[PDB]
Amino acid sequence: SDWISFSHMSSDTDHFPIKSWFRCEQKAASRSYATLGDMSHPQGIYEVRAAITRLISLTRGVKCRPEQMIIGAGTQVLMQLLTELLPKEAVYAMEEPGYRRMYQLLKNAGKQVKTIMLDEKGMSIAEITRQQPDVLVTTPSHQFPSGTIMPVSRRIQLLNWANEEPRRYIIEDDYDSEFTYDVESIPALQSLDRFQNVIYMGTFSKSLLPGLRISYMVLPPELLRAYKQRGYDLQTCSSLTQLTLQEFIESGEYQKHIKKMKQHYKEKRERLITALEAEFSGEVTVKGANAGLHFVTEFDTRRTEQDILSHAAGLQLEIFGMSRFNLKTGRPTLIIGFARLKEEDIQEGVQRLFKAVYG
């Protein structure tokens, strides 16, 4: 019962300011108790969309009114709605490797999904023009999983591509954008756009706890119109949660958590990358480590990825391989999530991995 986690699917419980979250919950519950008897506006409580709208416009340069926002019980519930609002026969394009869960969702709605390989600047604009889709889904802040940060040149190329023809859209999945380490934040695709072909998506999962389940998208007027024409939708976030968040942002706590955690995860990432280069001696390559809460390790070895996982499992080390992110070569890679990982476990973790890779 003594595991260590390099899992990317997990967060620190110890570092979340939970006592502050509950304080904001009470402050917020008292001020609006009245209102929790009525069901929330389908898009989300106005003031909550307002609170989120200021923040992302501050932290990422997103241009939007709160009327354009939809909240939010996780991305898949917004992405599902979004497919229902984009044209039924529209052809989707995802990164390769990609957020496989979203691929599976798109396939499960029987949508055609082309897959775009990546280059040094991220999702390839050559492959996009070659494969001629209608809807890109891209992770510019920290490509998931490869880690690549999309430079501004490529952001523009994608944007030019989207207004060459009508009925083309970009879904900017800004997952894991809150932290960026030895570079400055690049502002969002959505900020650079002048023609409103971007659907900006975000989540508080990464910056709070995975267990909270509050995410949001910003819809361009055309698609917002489409949303409003359905009439039947019902909000998926608990109103108390929506309000707790509101209060957690406005009070300044969220902004304070972000600054404290930015520092904490920068130090843990240094510690960990230093540790890895040490007990792997250069047999390792470390990729995509300037943002997010994971990076890639590529190892020099015979052993099949699948066996390293079995061995790692054997040594009580939770860990995942890159093959997981294939939508559709003897250098196996792993994903190293440094969110839950305690600093006492670093050394021991970097040992267990060296034994898992060799034995």
Which residues lie near a copy of itself (CB under 8 A)? 9-13, 16, 18, 22, 25-26, 29, 33-40, 73-74, 76-77, 80, 84, 100-101, 104-105, 108-109, 209-214, 230-241, 340
- Six-digit token pair at 40? 């929330």
Q: Which of 3, 9, 107, 222 binds ligand QL4 (CB under 6 A)?
A: 9
Please tell me whether residue 36 binds ligand QL4 under the rule CB under 6 A: no
Please tell me whether residue 99 binds ligand QL4 under the rule CB under 6 A: yes
Alpha carbon distance 256, 178 (integer Å): 12
Tell me the CA distances in angstroms from 274 to 177, 285, 331, one per residue in order: 23, 12, 21
Please tell me whether residue 34 binds ligand QL4 under the rule CB under 6 A: no
Please tell me whether residue 144 binds ligand QL4 under the rule CB under 6 A: yes
Alpha carbon distance 160, 38 (integer Å): 44
The stretch among 40-48, 74-82, 221-229, 308-316 that binds ligand QL4 (CB under 6 A) is 74-82
The stretch among 48-56, 86-94, 112-120, 203-211 that binds ligand QL4 (CB under 6 A) is 203-211
Please tell me whether residue 96 binds ligand QL4 under the rule CB under 6 A: no
The stretch among 44-52, 71-79, 147-155, 247-255 that binds ligand QL4 (CB under 6 A) is 71-79
- CB of 344 vs ligand QL4, minimal distance in Å: 20
Cis peptide before 97 (omega within 30 of 0): yes
Bridge partners of 297, per DSSP, are 286, 334
CA angle 179, 184, 190 (to 5 degrees): 80
Are 170 and 139 in contact, with CB atoms under 8 Å apart? no
Alpha carbon distance 284, 334 (integer Å): 11
Of 210, 218, 212, which is closest to residue 244 (Cα–Cα)? 212
User: 216 CB contacts (<8 Å, ≥6 apart)?
Assistant: 44, 49, 52, 69, 70, 71, 72, 78, 201, 202, 203
Are 133 and 93 in contact, with CB atoms under 8 Å apart? yes
Please tell me whether residue 101 binds ligand QL4 under the rule CB under 6 A: yes
Closest to a copy of itself by CB, 102 or 272: 102
Q: Which of 148, 180, 191, 215 binds ligand QL4 (CB under 6 A)?
A: 215
How far out from the chain centre does Cα 107 lie? Answer: 20
Q: Which of 60, 206, 268, 294 binds ligand QL4 (CB under 6 A)?
A: 206
Q: Which of 10, 80, 255, 347 binds ligand QL4 (CB under 6 A)?
A: 10
- Answer with the entry of ligand QL4, a copy of itself, none that 211 interacts with (C-beta below 5 to 8 A by kind): a copy of itself
- CB of 37 vs a copy of itself, minimal distance in Å: 4
Please tell me whether residue 197 binds ligand QL4 under the rule CB under 6 A: no
Please tell me whether residue 11 binds ligand QL4 under the rule CB under 6 A: yes
The stretch among 6-14, 57-65, 115-123, 244-252 that binds ligand QL4 (CB under 6 A) is 6-14
- Answer with the entry of a copy of itself, ligand QL4, none that 240 interacts with (C-beta below 5 to 8 A by kind): a copy of itself
Please tell me whether residue 294 binds ligand QL4 under the rule CB under 6 A: no
Using CB under 6 A as the criterion, what x/- string covers residues 316-345 for binding ligand QL4? -----------------------x------
Alpha carbon distance 11, 292 (integer Å): 12
Strand, helix or coil at 205? coil
- Answer with the entry of ligand QL4, a copy of itself, none that 108 interacts with (C-beta below 5 to 8 A by kind): a copy of itself
Q: Which residue has the tokens 């880690």?
A: 147
Alpha carbon distance 103, 137 (integer Å): 10
User: 256 CB contacts (<8 Å, ≥6 apart)?
Assistant: none
Closest to ligand QL4 by CB, 50 or 208: 208
The tally of CA atoms less than 13 A away on the side-chain side of residue 162 is 26
Q: Which residues here bind ligand QL4, judged by CB under 6 A?
A: 9-11, 74-76, 99, 101, 139, 144, 173, 175, 203, 205-206, 210, 215, 234, 339
